[PDB]
């Protein structure tokens, strides 16, 4: 079955309209993966980097590029960044400047928020080719974590504890016998949004859903992580060993991890339905 063709053509129809319906684009992003050629466009549109009207994209990208170059040149002028500075750290400093949270000098150690943004920025670099697009996608994504999900993300660990049992109760019982449930890497999974845990070629399938309003996809991604590694987790026998394994999971099974996490999230939270 050529369902990939159906998905791509439906998205091209959603993108053909002179006004892009962000609600339909969100529902599509929930229900299907984004083709890689339209992922940056659709992420820009849902993150509000580009407005719904397609005509306005040229001028708004001029605005975004001007803002990016102005902030970057300013960081160069106050010597906060340099040409050697990694692109992710450049994005971190640009975000700090734009949010008014720039330190006095780059030698000031990173705050936890800074490391979280840096991790998401590193992951974005591999997903988005263009530096301006990558920076804007990164900043809007992290801002969604701090604004659209400031209350939802803290609930995610409990949702993990719930759905983990609901798919294999004995597995969560195995974890709680180790009393390792509060020591699982929730800051990685839900503040850094699996940046640095999954390869970006499949972390992007997660982030399609995170952009389109779903941070529970993160819960199900973690759940499918532990379901995929049942053979290993049921052989794990210590809280610290579990914590270290979960921060460095084998990356080979990650494509299937995210695919089955999306399947699980479509099974437990239902299939998205187009509005009438």
């Amino acid at each position: 079955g050529f369902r990939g063709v159906e998905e791509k053509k439906s998205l091209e129809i959603l993108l053909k309209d002179d006004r892009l319906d962000t609600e339909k684009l969100c529902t599509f992003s929930q229900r299907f993966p984004l083709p890689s050629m339209y992922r940056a466009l659709v992420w820009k549109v849902l993150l509000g980097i580009l407005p719904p009207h397609h005509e306005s994209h040229a001028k708004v990208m001029m605005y975004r590029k001007e803002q990016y170059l102005d902030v970057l040149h300013a960081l160069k002028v106050v010597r906060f960044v340099s040409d050697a500075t990694p692109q992710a750290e450049v994005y971190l400093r640009m975000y700090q400047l734009e949010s008014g949270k720039l330190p006095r000098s780059p030698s000031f150690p990173l705050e936890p928020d800074d490391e979280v943004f840096l991790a998401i920025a590193k992951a974005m670099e591999e997903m988005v080719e263009d530096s301006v697009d990558c920076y804007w996608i990164t900043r809007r994504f992290v801002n969604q974590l701090n604004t659209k999900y400031r209350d939802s993300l803290p609930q995610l660990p409990k949702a993990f504890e719930q759905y983990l049992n609901l798919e294999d109760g004995r597995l969560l019982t195995h974890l709680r016998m180790c009393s390792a449930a509060p020591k699982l890497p929730y800051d990685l999974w839900f503040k850094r949004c699996f940046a640095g845990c999954l390869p970006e070629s499949s972390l992007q399938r997660v982030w399609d859903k995170v952009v389109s309003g779903s941070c529970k996809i993160l819960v199900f991604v973690a759940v499918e992580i532990l379901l995929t590694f049942k053979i290993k987790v049921m052989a794990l026998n210590s809280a610290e060993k579990i914590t270290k394994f979960l921060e460095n999971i084998p990356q080979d099974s990650s494509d299937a991890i995210v695919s089955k996490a999306i399947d699980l999230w479509h099974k437990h939270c239902g299939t998205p339905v187009h509005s009438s």
């Binding site: 006004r19 407005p51 005509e55 306005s56 001028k59 708004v60 605005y63």
Partner: protein
């Protein structure tokens, strides 16, 4: 009675015509309302940038 019924029928038909025309005008007004909504959405869409 015959004159009044001729005039009743013609005026009722004219009323139906005018009601359809007025419905068209109302539809145009609604369309222009959402056109203004679209216009100011586009305008603030790049004003925010």
């Amino acid at each position: 009675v015959l004159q009044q019924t001729q005039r009743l029928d013609t005026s009722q038909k004219r009323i139906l015509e005018l009601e359809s025309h007025l419905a068209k005008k109302d539809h145009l007004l609604l369309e222009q309302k959402k056109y203004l909504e679209d216009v100011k959405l586009q305008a603030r869409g790049q004003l925010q940038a």
